[PDB]
């Protein structure tokens, strides 16, 4: 039936989702922290940027 077909589709989708490589959360957190600290040097809108370079002029 239609319910049988949709349940089989969901089961197959779950099987496909299970067949995915797993990456440790620590590595992802380290990469995120590294990117954040590497690009924090420029960081406009956070660093005290000079008042004569912002073209808003107010």
């Amino acid at each position: 039936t239609a319910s049988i077909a949709q349940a089989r589709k969901l089961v197959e989708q779950l099987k496909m989702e299970a067949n995915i490589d797993r990456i440790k959360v620590s590595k992802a957190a380290a990469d995120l922290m590294a990117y954040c600290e590497a690009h924090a040097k420029e960081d406009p809108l956070l660093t005290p940027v000079p008042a004569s370079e912002n073209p808003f002029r107010e």
């Binding site: 319910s3 049988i4 349940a7 089989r8 969901l10 089961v11 989708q13 779950l14 099987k15 989702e17 299970a18 995915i20 797993r22 990456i23 440790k24 959360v25 620590s26 992802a28 957190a29 990469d31 995120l32 922290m33 990117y35 954040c36 690009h39 924090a40 420029e42 960081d43 406009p44 809108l45 956070l46 912002n54 073209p55 808003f56 107010e58």
Partner: protein
Amino acid sequence: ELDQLRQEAEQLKNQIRDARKACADATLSQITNNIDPVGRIQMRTRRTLRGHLAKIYAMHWGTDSRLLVSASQDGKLIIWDSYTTNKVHAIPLRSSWVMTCAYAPSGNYVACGGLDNICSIYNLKTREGNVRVSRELAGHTGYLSCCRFLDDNQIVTSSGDTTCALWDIETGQQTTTFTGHTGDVMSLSLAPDTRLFVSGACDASAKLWDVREGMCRQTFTGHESDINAICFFPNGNAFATGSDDATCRLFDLRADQELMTYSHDNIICGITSVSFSKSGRLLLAGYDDFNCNVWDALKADRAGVLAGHDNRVSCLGVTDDGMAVATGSWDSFLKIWN
């Protein structure tokens, strides 16, 4: 046979949850506590954009980071020049119920959508000075929530029919229709690599879709209300989700894990719009408390508060270079804050 399918689905769910629990053997709370806090942050409004009639429902920015667009409940799509604070374009619509905006990377196409279930593509730079509806997009049954341009001849539409769709502008066909979810979808966000995008539905479950293969790729859960806003990390590894339960969350694609979240025991309203900065150090979220309450992306600490609006904040945006922030609320007042 239905019972067998149910039991095998439950077994698969048990297996995947056990695998997820096995992988979640670490957390970043301690290490982010080790890092130095950013400190005190305060910003003040620089310009104020006004001229709409009813509550502003959307806002999007162009790659030039100078001009932008806004959509009103009246039925007006207005293209602003933010530097000089001028209106450069004004476009009336046929449907008065519009809740979408988009601006083409090429800089000459604009889209709009909403209850009418038709997404209109407008040609900004034609032989004639005036701007005309280039094409129309039928097919969706439910209301359109948002629309994004993949390129100059492609577009992605998210509708109230619990189904999203790619569209080729030239042929006007609902090619590459992504079907999934149970409840309606209301938010979308593309990727810099222009190969994947995530969608959020009211059933508290976000789906990462790959455009090329045209089927579902990843699934993320963890919220207790409808998904109200979505944004995608500049690095392309993470994304931010905002719901109506006063909780913002951050997830990572590679780990496929519900990562750290935010909470402050002084707010009860729901989030409406969420957006990062250039470097991703701080995250701006709009609430119903008539202000933008900015958080630190790593410390999960309230570092700065941005008041100045007197109604619900329904859309906010940060330009690509992290140069400035724009916020538009239900008082019909776009304001640039820096």
